[PDB]
Each structure stands twice: as C-alpha cells, then as structure tokens.
C-alpha cells in the first residue's frame, strides 16, 4: 500500500501542470501582443511575377490574437489566475474581433473582385464609378485610429 501510494504521489508530481501555465504567461508578457494602432496598414511588397513593388493593402490585425483570448477564456475557468493586463488585452481583443474579421474579409473580397475586373480591361471603364466610391470609403476609413 505504501509503495503504491509513493508511486502515485511521484507520478502526480511528474504530472504537475502550473509550470506550463506560468511559462505561457511569461511568453505572452514578453511578446506583448496588442492590436492598438491603425485601422489597417498599407505595406510594400515585391510580389513575384512583376518587377514593381506592390503596395498591397493589409489589415493591422493579427488573426492569431483571438487564439490568445481563447486561451484566457479557457484558463480563467481552469482556475489559473492570469495578470490583469493580460485579462484586459484578451477581453478587448475578444470584443473587437468581429469588426476586424468583417474588415479583413471585406478588403480581401474587394481585392479579389478588383483584380478580376482589371483582368478584363474591357469592363473597368464602366465599373470606375463603383471603384471610385469604394476608394473614397477606404480613404475615409484609413485615417481612423
């Protein structure tokens, strides 16, 4: 009986769990995830296939941030307490996620449809008005923090 209980206690000691929680929290704090900044970012990329530098339009929002939220949204009920700054960042990211995902899907769809249009140059002249209004809407949005 005592040998068995010693075996089980040793196994349980090997079966501790908090250390990984601690390491993950430390990694989160070190990496300093965030979303604050511009509504979306315009960047420079030299896409292979063309000599020029393409100013492809992206969204200032890492899709992985929500993952962190879910971790917290789990670890909180797991009984492990996470630092208040991390709680705040995860909560803000979770509440703000829907807007970001709608934005990114919308901009990707717009890019796909505009490249489809310009693939057929015979039609861009007609669609120019819609492209103008969309560009105006993007121009209005981009200035926002």
């Amino acid at each position: 009986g005592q040998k068995l209980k010693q075996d089980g206690d040793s196994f349980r000691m090997k079966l501790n769990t908090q250390e990984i929680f601690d390491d993950w929290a430390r990694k989160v704090q070190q990496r300093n995830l965030g979303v604050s900044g511009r509504i979306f970012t315009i960047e420079s990329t030299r896409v292979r296939g063309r000599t020029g530098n393409v100013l492809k339009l992206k969204v200032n929002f890492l899709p992985e941030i929500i993952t962190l939220s879910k971790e917290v949204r789990n670890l909180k009920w797991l009984g492990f307490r996470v630092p208040l700054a991390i709680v705040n960042k995860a909560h803000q990211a979770n509440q703000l996620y829907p807007f970001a995902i709608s934005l990114i899907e919308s901009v990707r769809t717009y890019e796909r449809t505009c490249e489809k249009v310009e693939e057929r140059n015979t039609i861009s002249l007609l669609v120019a008005g819609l492209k103008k209004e969309v560009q105006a809407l993007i121009a209005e949005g981009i200035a926002l923090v």
Partner: peptide, 21 residues
C-alpha cells in the same frame, strides 16, 4: 467620363498620408 485612378496610385498616396499622420 469616370476615371479609373489605378489602384497603385491611390494606394501610394494613402501610404504617404498614413506615413505623414
């Protein structure tokens, strides 16, 4: 008539605006 204003020019202009803001 309506103009196209190629996406690259608009993108670079707004890149400049974001840089300066």
């Amino acid at each position: 008539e309506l103009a196209a204003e190629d996406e690259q020019v608009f993108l670079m202009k707004q890149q400049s605006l974001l840089a300066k803001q």
